[PDB]
Amino acid sequence: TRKTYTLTDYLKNTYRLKLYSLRWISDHEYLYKQENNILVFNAEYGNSSVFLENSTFDEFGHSINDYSISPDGQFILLEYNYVKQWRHSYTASYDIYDLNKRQLITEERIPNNTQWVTWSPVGHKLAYVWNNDIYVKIEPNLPSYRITWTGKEDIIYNGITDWVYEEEVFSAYSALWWSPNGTFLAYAQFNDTEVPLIEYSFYSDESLQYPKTVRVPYPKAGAVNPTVKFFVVNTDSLSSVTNATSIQITAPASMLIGDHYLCDVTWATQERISLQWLRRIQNYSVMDICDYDESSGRWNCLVARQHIEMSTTGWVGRFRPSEPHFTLDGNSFYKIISNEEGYRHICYFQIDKKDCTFITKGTWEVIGIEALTSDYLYYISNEYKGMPGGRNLYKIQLSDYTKVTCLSCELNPERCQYYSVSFSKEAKYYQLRCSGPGLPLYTLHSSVNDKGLRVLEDNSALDKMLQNVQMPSKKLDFIILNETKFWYQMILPPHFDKSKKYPLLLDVYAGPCSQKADTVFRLNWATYLASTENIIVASFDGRGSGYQGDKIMHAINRRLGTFEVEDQIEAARQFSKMGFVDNKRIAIWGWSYGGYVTSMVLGSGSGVFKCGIAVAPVSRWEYYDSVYTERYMGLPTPEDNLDHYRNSTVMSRAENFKQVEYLLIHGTADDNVHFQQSAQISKALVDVGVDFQAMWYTDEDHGIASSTAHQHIYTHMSHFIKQCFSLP
Amino acid sequence: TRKTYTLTDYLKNTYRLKLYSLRWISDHEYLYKQENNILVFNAEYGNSSVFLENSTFDEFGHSINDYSISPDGQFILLEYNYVKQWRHSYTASYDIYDLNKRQLITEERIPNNTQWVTWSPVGHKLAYVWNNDIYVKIEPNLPSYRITWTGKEDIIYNGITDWVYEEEVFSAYSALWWSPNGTFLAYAQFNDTEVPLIEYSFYSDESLQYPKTVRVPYPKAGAVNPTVKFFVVNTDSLSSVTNATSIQITAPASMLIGDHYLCDVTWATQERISLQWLRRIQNYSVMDICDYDESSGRWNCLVARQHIEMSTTGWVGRFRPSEPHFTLDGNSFYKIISNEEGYRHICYFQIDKKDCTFITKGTWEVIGIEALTSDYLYYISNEYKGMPGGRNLYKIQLSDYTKVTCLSCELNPERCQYYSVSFSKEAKYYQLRCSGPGLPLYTLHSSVNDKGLRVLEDNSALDKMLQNVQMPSKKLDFIILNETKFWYQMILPPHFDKSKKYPLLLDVYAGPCSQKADTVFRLNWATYLASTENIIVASFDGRGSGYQGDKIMHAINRRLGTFEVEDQIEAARQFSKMGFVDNKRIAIWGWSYGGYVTSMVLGSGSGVFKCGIAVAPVSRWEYYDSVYTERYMGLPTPEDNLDHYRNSTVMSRAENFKQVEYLLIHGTADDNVHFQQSAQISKALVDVGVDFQAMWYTDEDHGIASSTAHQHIYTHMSHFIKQCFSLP
Numbered sequence A, B: 001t002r003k004t005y006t007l008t009d010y011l012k013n014t015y016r017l018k019l020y021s022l023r024w025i026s027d028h029e030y031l032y033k034q035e036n037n038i039l040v041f042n043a044e045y046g047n048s049s050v051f052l053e054n055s056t057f058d059e060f061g062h063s064i065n066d067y068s069i070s071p072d073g074q075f076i077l078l079e080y081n082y083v084k085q086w087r088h089s090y091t092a093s094y095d096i097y098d099l100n101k102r103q104l105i106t107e108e109r110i111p112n113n114t115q116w117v118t119w120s121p122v123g124h125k126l127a128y129v130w131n132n133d134i135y136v137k138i139e140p141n142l143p144s145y146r147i148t149w150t151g152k153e154d155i156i157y158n159g160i161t162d163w164v165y166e167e168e169v170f171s172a173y174s175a176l177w178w179s180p181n182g183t184f185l186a187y188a189q190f191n192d193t194e195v196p197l198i199e200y201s202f203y204s205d206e207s208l209q210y211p212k213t214v215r216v217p218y219p220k221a222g223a224v225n226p227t228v229k230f231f232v233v234n235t236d237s238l239s240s241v242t243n244a245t246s247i248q249i250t251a252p253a254s255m256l257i258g259d260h261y262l263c264d265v266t267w268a269t270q271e272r273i274s275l276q277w278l279r280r281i282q283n284y285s286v287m288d289i290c291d292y293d294e295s296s297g298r299w300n301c302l303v304a305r306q307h308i309e310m311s312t313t314g315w316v317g318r319f320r321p322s323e324p325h326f327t328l329d330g331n332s333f334y335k336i337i338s339n340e341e342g343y344r345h346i347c348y349f350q351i352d353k354k355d356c357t358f359i360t361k362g363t364w365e366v367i368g369i370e371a372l373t374s375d376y377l378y379y380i381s382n383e384y385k386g387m388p389g390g391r392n393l394y395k396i397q398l399s400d401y402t403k404v405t406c407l408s409c410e411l412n413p414e415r416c417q418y419y420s421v422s423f424s425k426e427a428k429y430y431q432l433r434c435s436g437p438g439l440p441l442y443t444l445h446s447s448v449n450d451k452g453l454r455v456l457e458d459n460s461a462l463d464k465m466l467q468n469v470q471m472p473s474k475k476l477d478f479i480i481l482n483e484t485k486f487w488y489q490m491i492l493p494p495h496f497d498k499s500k501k502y503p504l505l506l507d508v509y510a511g512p513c514s515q516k517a518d519t520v521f522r523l524n525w526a527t528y529l530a531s532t533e534n535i536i537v538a539s540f541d542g543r544g545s546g547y548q549g550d551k552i553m554h555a556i557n558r559r560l561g562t563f564e565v566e567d568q569i570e571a572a573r574q575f576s577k578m579g580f581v582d583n584k585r586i587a588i589w590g591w592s593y594g595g596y597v598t599s600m601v602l603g604s605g606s607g608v609f610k611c612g613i614a615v616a617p618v619s620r621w622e623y624y625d626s627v628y629t630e631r632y633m634g635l636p637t638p639e640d641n642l643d644h645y646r647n648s649t650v651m652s653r654a655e656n657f658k659q660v661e662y663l664l665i666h667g668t669a670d671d672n673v674h675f676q677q678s679a680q681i682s683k684a685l686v687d688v689g690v691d692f693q694a695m696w697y698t699d700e701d702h703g704i705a706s707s708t709a710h711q712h713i714y715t716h717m718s719h720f721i722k723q724c725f726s727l728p
C-alpha cells in the first residue's frame, strides 16, 4: 500500500535529515546560517539578528564556498575557487571583508591557490601557507611576513602535513598551532625527500589527449617515512626588514634514536606548550612540556616534566595517543588513557609528577573529554545501560570524583541514546546533538544548572513524511563468545514476520577500533535493501572493535586479517541458523578495510556466504601506508612481522573464491587504497581460474563520491545483490 | 548422439589442427623440426636426415625459445630468456654453436639483452642491435665492430624501429637490411626526441610493492611524429681502417618540405637499393632507386629513376605502398598498384621510365607477388570464381602476359579455396598451403612442370576425431546494395533448420581493408558458440573493407565511424529478414577496431541489437597513433578534419546505451589501444547514468593473450552471451 524506501529515494535524498550547525562566537552567542542569511543568536532567550544578509555579496562575482569570521569578528574570511585534494586538504582563493567599513579589503590580499589559512585564536591575525611556506599577516590589508623559505612542492611541507600525516595522523591538512592569545605561531615541518612515490594515470576530461600521471609522496609499509620538525616564532616581533627566527623544539632523546612522528600538539598556557612524540614502533610515545624562557628567547622542556605513555598489549591510544586538557594555570592536565584493566578512562596529571590519578573507572570507556571548568570536566562516554554503542554527556566534579552526573541519559531514553556536544567559549552553555535511535534532536542547555533552554531542531518535518513510508526496523542486541559479548545490529524490513525466511547481507568494516553496531539512525543503502528488497542487513563488531577495552581491541595486534575475519564468519553462521534467515542467501560486502574483510572472508572456505561485494579493498598490507599499517602490523621484515604480512594477503586465497559469486569495485584515482590493490587481486583470481565481476571507476578516489559515480555504483551493487538473492 | 565442440575444447585446444612450417635453406633442401630435431628434407626426393638431434642442447641449461641457423649452415643461433615487448619486438640472450666443430663459442659472445639479431643472407656474418646500437661480426667467434655510437634509450633507435614504426609501418622490429650478398648493411635510425610519452602503470608481480610506470614514445593523432634518417655501411671494409663510416641517403626533397615516413626498403641488386617515402599526408609517396658510386663512395639516386605513387581517392596502398620485385639485372621491377579502375594490380616498371604497364587487370585484385623468375612471376589473387574471400596462386609468363595459369585453383576445389605459398631459393620448388574452407592441407610441388610432388600434412587425424562431434557449417554468400554486392559469412549450428529462428551474434572488425568474410577454416569461439549454444555467428565486409577495389575500400576515407558502421547494422537487418534469426536475440561484439564499431553500433540507437561486447576498443581517434589514425582521418585540426574527429567518438553516443546491455573489457597494460580509451567510455556512461558490465585485465596487452586470461576473458564473455540470450 504505502511506498517503501527506494534506492531512488536514497541516491536522491527525497528524505533529507535536518541538522543545526551553529558556531559559538562568544560564551553566549552563536552564528547560524538560515536561508543563506547568517544570523546571530543569544543562547539564553534565543532571540536573533541578521548578522550578514544573504544578499551582501549578491554581486561578489564568485560562488562563495565557505566563510570564517575572525575571533573578534572585525572581519570575515571568504573562500572560493575550492579544489579538493585528499581527505582534508584543498587549495582555494580568499578575500577579506572588513565587517565594519563594509569593504572587501583589496590592498595586499591572500594569493590564489592558498593551501590553508587560519586566524589567530583571538583578534584578527591571519596565518597562511602558499607554496609550502607559512605567511603571517598582522593586519588584513598590510603585507605579510614570509616566515619560511623552504617551501618546495612535494618535498618540504611547512605548516601543512603531507599525504601520510594528513590522513593517518592529523586528520587535517593544517600543521601550525597559534598560541592562546596569538603571540606564538608554532608549526611542524615535513621533509618527504627520500619517500617513494605512488603513481597513477589520471585521464581527466575527454579532451586530454594523453593521460596524466599523478605522482604522490606516499610511504607504504616498511618504506622510508617523512621527517618532521617543530618550530615556534614570536608573531609580535617580526621585522619587515628582516627574516623571522623560528626557534626549533627538538624531539627528545628516546625519540630521535629512530624513525618517529609528531603525533599531537597542544598549547597549555600563553607561554607553555606540550608535544607528544610517537615512535615508528607505535607502542611508545613521549609528551614534552616546553616553557618559554623570556631571557634566552629559546624554549625549554624540563625532562622532569616529561611523561611517558606506552603499551605492552599493543599500540598507543585508539588511533593515536590522546590529546591533553590543561587547567587554566597549566600545572596539570587531564588525558584519556587505558588503565590496568584495558579500558580507556580519564587520568589526572601534575605536569611534573610521574603518576596520574584516574578520575573514572569501570568496564566502559571514555569517548572524549569535552570541557574543563575549574569545578568540572565534561566528557562523553558509553557507560549508561552498559551498551558500548551508545554515548552520553557526563560531568565529574573535579573536587569529588564520585559526584558524576549524566546530563543526557534520561533526557529521552526512548528516542535518544547517542549524543554529541558543543560548548560555547567558557562552557557556559552547550548544545546536545542526539543522533539516534529516533530522528535527530538538537537542544541547547546551560552549565549553571543543566536547564534545557530550548529545542533547536526536531526533524518533525521528516518525521511526518516517514510515517507514509514503510521504514525498516533496527535491533541492537548481542552474542556471548568466550563469556564476552560482542554486539550486532540488524536492519529489519517492515512487517518483519519471524515465521519467514529473509535473505541476509552482512554489512562489514571490521577494522581496528571500529564500531559498526551502534544506536544511530541512518538513511542509507541498507534502509533501501531492508525496506524495498526485504533483505536483512546486519553488522557485527567482534574481536578488534573498540570502545570496549584493550583485551578486545588489541586482540588483533600484529594479526590483522585473522580474528576479525573469523569473527565476522562466526556471527554469520550463528545468524545463518536463526529461523528467520535464509542460509542459502547470505552475502557480505565491504568498503575500504571492509572490502578487505569481505575479501578475506569470501576466500575463507566457510561456505557461509553465497556472494559478496568488496569496494576499494586492501589486498595485502605491504601496499598500504606505513603509519596505519605498521601501527597494527609492525615492520615488514623477517626480524619483525613478515610472515604475517605475507600470510594476510587476499591473493593467497584466490582459489577459494571458486565457491562464491564475487564483485570487485575500485576507483582508478584512489590515492588512499591504490587501484594497485584490486588490480592485484583480480590477476590472482584470473590465474586460478575463478570467474567474478568487476568494475572500475575512472578518476574516482577512495570515495567514489562524485554524484554520477555514486548513483551508478550503488545501482550496480543492488543489481548484483538482487541477482544473487533472486529478487524481482 | 555425438558430443559437441565445447568451449573447453576451444580453450584447451583439444582438437589440434596440424600444419607444416618449413624453412628453405636452398633451392632443394628445407629444414623442418620433426619431434624436437631439425631435419633436412630434400624436395626432389623427400628422403631426410637428422640435421640437429633433439638431445643436443640437453645439458644447455636453459629453455631455448628458437634456433636460427646461419645461411651457410655453418652455425646456429640459440635464442633464450625470451622477453616479449610489443607486437613483434622482444629482447633475448643468444649463443652460437659451431655446428661443424660441434662446439659452443665462448669468447666474444653476443650481449645479453640484444634487442635484435640477423645472419647475413649468405655465409655467416652477424649484425645485432644492443642498446639502440648496431654491431657487426664477421666471425661468430671474433669481437664486434660498433656501427653507431648515437644509441640512446627512448630517444635514438638505430637498426630497430620505435613504437609507431614497429606497429604501423614495417610490422617488424628490425630496422636494418642486408644486401643480396650481405656486403652492405643499410639501416634506418629513429629520433623520437620530442615525441610525447604514453604513461601507463604495470603492477608487476604481487611482490612488487610499488607500481611501475611504463612510459613510451608514442605519437597520437596530430601530435609530434618521430623523424627518420637512412644509412648504408660496407661490412667488408671494417677490418682495414679505423672506426666505421655510414653513408647517409636523404629522402627526396618532395618529402623534406614537411614531415614524412620511410615505408619501404628494398634491395634490387648488389649495389642498387630502393627506398619509399610517404608524406605525413599518406596520399602521395615516392620511390628513389639508389646505386653505389665507387668513385664517390656515396649512394647516388638519379631523379630520373624516381617514381611517384599517389591516390586522389584516399591513401596509398592497403596499409602502405606495396613493394617492388626487381628482375635479376635490377633494371626493372614489378609492383602491385591501383589501376585506373581502382583495383590493385601488378604493373611493369623500367627504372628510368615513368609509365609502367599493367600485366593483369579486371574486377578482382592481386593480393601479392610471391616470386619472380626469369620466365614467370608468381602471384596470389582472389580472381578465381570471382570470390574476394578467396586466394589462389597464379602463374604469368613474362614473354606473354596473355598466358596466365592458375597453379592451385583446380587442385581440390571443394576443400581448398584459400592458398598461401612458400617457394624455394630460386623458385624451383614450392609449398602450397590450403587453409580452407575444408581442413587445411599442405602439399609440395615442382615449378618446372607444376606437377604435385607429394603431401606434407593432410590433417586426416583431426578429420577422424571430428566425425565424432557436432561441427558447425560455414556459408559464404552475399547480398546486394546500391548495385554493389557485399560478401558475408555465417557459422551455422549442426542440423541448422532454416525453418527455425536462431539467435545471432554478429562478429565484426570493419577496419579499413579488413576482410572478415572468407573461405578460411577455423576452430574458434564462434565454433563453440554455434556448435554448443546453437547460435548463428556472422560477419560482414561492407564499405571500407578491402580486396575488392578502392571504390569499396576508400569509401570511408576521412570518415571513420560511419559507413562501415551504418553498414554492419544493415547486414543485421538483412539477416533477420532471412527468417531464421531471432530479432529479439541479436548481439554484436568486436575487438580493437572491431571493438570500436561494436561500441558505435550499440549507441547507434538502431534498436537492432540487444546486447554487445567491445574488447579493447578505440573510443575516440585522437587517442590513437598518428601513422594509422591520420591515414584515414587526416589531421585533427580545424583547418583539416577536426570536425569528424570530434563527431565520431563513442563517448557522445553514451545516452543511447540505455537501450542495450553493454560489456566493456580492456587490458590495463594495453600499449596499443591504451586503457585510456575505455576509461573514457565508462566515465562517459557513468556520467549519463547507464549501467553496464566491465572487466579489466591487470597487465594484459592489446591481445589479452595470457594463457589464464585468454581462458578467462572468453569464459566471462561466454556467460554474458548466454544470459544475454537466456538459453541458458
Ligand SMILES: *[C@](O)(c1nnc(C(C)(C)C)o1)[C@@H]1C[C@H](F)CN1C(=O)CNC(C)(C)CO
Pocket (backbone or CB within 6 Å): A166, A167, A168, A169, A171, A509, A511, A591, A592, A593, A594, A618, A624, A628, A672, A673, A702
Ligand atoms: C579504509 O578502511 C577506509 N577509508 N575510509 C574509511 C572509513 C573509516 C570507513 C571512513 O575506511 C582504508 C584502508 C585501511 F583499512 C585504512 N583506511 C583508511 O582510510 C585510514 N584512515 C582513517 C580514517 C582510519 C584515519 O586516517
Ligand SMILES: *[C@](O)(c1nnc(C(C)(C)C)o1)[C@@H]1C[C@H](F)CN1C(=O)CNC(C)(C)CO
Pocket (backbone or CB within 6 Å): B167, B168, B319, B511, B591, B592, B593, B594, B618, B628, B672, B673, B702
Ligand atoms: C586493432 O584494430 C587491432 N590490433 N590488432 C588487431 C587484429 C588485426 C585483430 C589482430 O586489431 C587496433 C585499433 C585500430 F583499429 C588499429 N589497431 C592496430 O593494432 C594497428 N593496425 C594494424 C594491425 C593495421 C597495424 O598494426
